[PDB]
Structure formats: C-alpha cells, structure tokens
Amino acid sequence: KQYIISEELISEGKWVKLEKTTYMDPTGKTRTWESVKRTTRKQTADGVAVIPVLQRTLHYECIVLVKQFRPPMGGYCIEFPAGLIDDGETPEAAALRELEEETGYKGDIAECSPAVCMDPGLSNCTIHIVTVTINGDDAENARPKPKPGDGEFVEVISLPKNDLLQRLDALVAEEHLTVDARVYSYALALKHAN
Amino acid sequence: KQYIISEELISEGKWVKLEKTTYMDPTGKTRTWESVKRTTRKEQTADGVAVIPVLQRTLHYECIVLVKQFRPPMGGYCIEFPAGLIDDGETPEAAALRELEEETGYKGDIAECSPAVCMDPGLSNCTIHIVTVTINGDDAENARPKPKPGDGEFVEVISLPKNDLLQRLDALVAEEHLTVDARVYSYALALKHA
Ligand SMILES: Cc1nn(Cc2c(C)noc2C)c(=O)s1
Ligand SMILES: [Cl-]
Ligand SMILES: [Mg+2]
Ligand SMILES: [Mg+2]
Ligand SMILES: [Mg+2]
Ligand SMILES: [Mg+2]
Numbered sequence A: 001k002q003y004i005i006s007e008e009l010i011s012e013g014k015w016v017k018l019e020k021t022t023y024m025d026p027t028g029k030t031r032t033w034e035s036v037k038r039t040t041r042k043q044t045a046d047g048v049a050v051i052p053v054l055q056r057t058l059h060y061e062c063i064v065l066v067k068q069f070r071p072p073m074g075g076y077c078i079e080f081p082a083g084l085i086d087d088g089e090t091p092e093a094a095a096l097r098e099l100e101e102e103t104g105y106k107g108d109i110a111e112c113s114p115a116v117c118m119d120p121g122l123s124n125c126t127i128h129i130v131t132v133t134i135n136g137d138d139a140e141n142a143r144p145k146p147k148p149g150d151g152e153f154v155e156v157i158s159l160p161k162n163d164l165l166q167r168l169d170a171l172v173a174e175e176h177l178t179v180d181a182r183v184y185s186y187a188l189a190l191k192h193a194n
Numbered sequence B: 001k002q003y004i005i006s007e008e009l010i011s012e013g014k015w016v017k018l019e020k021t022t023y024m025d026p027t028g029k030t031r032t033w034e035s036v037k038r039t040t041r042k043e044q045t046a047d048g049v050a051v052i053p054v055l056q057r058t059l060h061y062e063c064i065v066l067v068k069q070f071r072p073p074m075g076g077y078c079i080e081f082p083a084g085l086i087d088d089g090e091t092p093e094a095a096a097l098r099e100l101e102e103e104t105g106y107k108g109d110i111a112e113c114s115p116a117v118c119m120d121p122g123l124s125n126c127t128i129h130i131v132t133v134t135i136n137g138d139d140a141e142n143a144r145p146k147p148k149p150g151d152g153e154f155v156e157v158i159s160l161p162k163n164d165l166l167q168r169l170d171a172l173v174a175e176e177h178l179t180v181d182a183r184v185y186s187y188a189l190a191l192k193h194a
Helices: A091-103 A161-175 A181-192 B092-104 B162-175 B182-193
Strands: A003-012 A016-024 A030-038 A047-055 A062-070 A075-079 A082-084 A108-117 A126-135 A155-160 B003-012 B016-024 B030-038 B048-056 B063-071 B076-080 B083-085 B109-113 B127-136 B156-161 B179-181
Touching: A003 A030, A003 B003, A016 B016, A016 B030, A047 A091, A047 B182, A062 A091, A062 A161, A075 A161, A082 A091, A091 A108, A091 A126, A108 B182, A126 B182, A155 A161, A161 A181, A181 B048, A181 B127, A181 B182, B003 B030, B048 B092, B063 B092, B063 B162, B076 B182, B083 B092, B092 B109, B092 B127, B156 B162, B162 B179, B162 B182, B179 B182
Parallel strands: A047 A126, A108 B179, B048 B127, B076 B179
Antiparallel strands: A003 A016, A016 A030, A047 A062, A047 A082, A062 A075, A062 A155, A108 A126, B003 B016, B016 B030, B048 B063, B048 B083, B063 B076, B063 B156, B109 B127
16 A cells, blocks of 8 residues: 655765655655665675574573674674675575674574564665574684674674573673664563563 | 764754764774764663563463554565654653554553663664563453554554464565564564574
C-alpha cells in the first residue's frame, strides 16, 4: 500500500549522504522523510557483523567483542566485529576477514542471516550477522595477530556467554563505554531464553 | 587516548544533520569522520527506546510482540521491536510503555531498562534504551488491544513465539519482501544459541 515516489539529494560526502524521500502513505497522502544512506554500497548489504563464539575446552564459551573509539559517538563503544563488505566479496568471507583483521581470530562459519536493517527509521544501512565459531584450542588461534587496516585501532574483549549481559553492565557501570544495541540485544536474549 | 577536536556542521535537516568530525587518533594524528546525528535530542539520556515486549498468557507459550511498518529510508516494510523517540522530560520507561501501547494496543509492565546503547556507532551518535516489558495477556486490558498510531503511523502487530522466533522470522522473510531489524535478529539468534 505504501511506497517511494522520489528521493532528493540534500547533501553528499565521501561516505554518507542525506536524502529527502517522498512516499505515499496508505491513505493516499504524500509525505516526506529525511533518510540517510551510505555512498559506498554496490553488495547484498553494506556490512557484516560477526558473532564470534570462542570455544576452549575446560573454559566458558566466550563471545568475542571489540572496543573502538567511534567518532560519531565521541567515545569508546563495545561492539561485535564488523566492517563493510568489499565490492565482489561474499558476506561469509567479509566476516572471516574482518574477524581476522580486528581480533586475529581464525574462525569457521556456522550460519549467515539475511540482510538486516541497522536503524530503519533513519538509514537504509544493512548488515549480515554472521555466526562464527572459533576453535580456541587450535594453535592458529593460540596467540592471535590482529591486522588492523589504516585508521583502525581495536582492543579485543572476550566475555563469557553465560553471564554476558551482567558483564556488559559492569563495563558500562565502570568504564563509561557505550555497548552496541545488537550486542545488548543478543545478551538480553541469552538471559530471557527458557 | 582518543577524543573529539571539533564538529563542523555540514547540513541540517528538520530531524537529521550531517557533521564533519575532527578527532585525535591514538598515534597523535588528527583525522576526520562524517557523522549523522538527530536534531531532536535535548536532555534525553538517549534519542529513543525500543521495547522487547514479552506477551505472557496462561497456557500459551510466551510471545515477542513485533511491529511491521513501512520505513522510508529502507524503501520497504521492516519487522522491528516497538520503538519511538523519547519526548522531552519523558523517562525511557515511560516512553517504552507509551510507544508499546500506541503501536500495539498492549498495556505493559516494566521489567528492566538498559543503559543507552548505540544504534550504528560507525555512522551516528544515535542511542536507545532497550526496555524489557512483560504484558499480562490474561488481563482484560490486554484482551483485544487497539493500536493508537499517531499522525502518519501505520503499524501491524505480529506476535511470534519466543521458543521458535528465528524460524518464524525466517519464514516471514521467506514469504515476502521485508527486512528484519538487526536487533530483533540478534535477540532471535541468542534465543537459539542459549
Ligand atoms: C517528529 C519527528 N519525526 N521524526 C521521524 C522523521 C524523520 C527522521 N524524517 O522525517 C520524519 C517525520 C524524527 O526523527 S522527529
Ligand atoms: Cl553457536
Ligand atoms: Mg569494524
Ligand atoms: Mg576491519
Ligand atoms: Mg515507532
Ligand atoms: Mg510511535
């Protein structure tokens, strides 16, 4: 019933644009929206984010997260490894690459989501959430070498999956980090399950 | 180590602005970033709220109440937790309970409320509180609930069993063109992974 009639460029940068979208609401009334897009995307989606399950025997499973200064937030955020999918890359390979670049972890794909929206009231940005396990007992993951590209500065933080929500609350409580929404959402459902 | 140096306005819309952010990188080098921000955020601890509404109902499996709406930035229908912006002076819990009633008709009870969490921190400063709310579906208030959508709001309620949420979401994505929100998908993945 609803649909786009037109888009108007308001402002373009090297990475992000701001558009004015005209849409038909369901009553047959024309309406406007200020919408944000990435300039970079071709791709099944803009990005991937990796849920990395570190499995070591005789240890808790951990979820592997990254801390990065995020200039939009003006502070440090805890997030799932993530980055944009390069032209002609597959969502899975982007996942394994970014996981390796940001953590040093060599991992295995378990499952891959369809494209999911990041903030659909504001942007069109989408990602593939890619669940990956990490055999933490394999010698290649024994002393993992994070290979950040230019401009990235990433600290790795592994947290036990069985207490993930409580561990994140402590980090917010004490470190004044911002936790990412998808991460928090995952941590919550761990608690809410069953 | 890192911190903001200056933020220069690039373009201001009615509800969204683009900014050129200058920050210090952790090598002591000045770098810049293009940032998206809302123009609405006042004293609100976050821009918005999203509600994780657990519909509880005697001799029913617990459901997660979701909404389906046209999202202009996306040019399509999206499945999301109930959500809205926090009004000036409104508490996040108060906004969650009001947005949930407006969008679904259900009258909830607060369970918990997150710190402010970042929506898409490589692109924006946007934050939310993720507020968990239980709905007593046995209560007669919650019997045949009527959405009260505001001006230009057109919302469909989709209640899906917690114990089968991801497969039920995958099923809906299978049968039509629509995107699942990443926080909903993340929570559905954690329910499978626990
Ligand atoms: C009132 C508000 N409405 N919105 C949503 C919106 C956006 C984004 N562009 O057009 C509209 C309308 C806010 O962000 S404050
Ligand atoms: Cl797993
Ligand atoms: Mg990244
Ligand atoms: Mg990277
Ligand atoms: Mg809403
Ligand atoms: Mg609303």
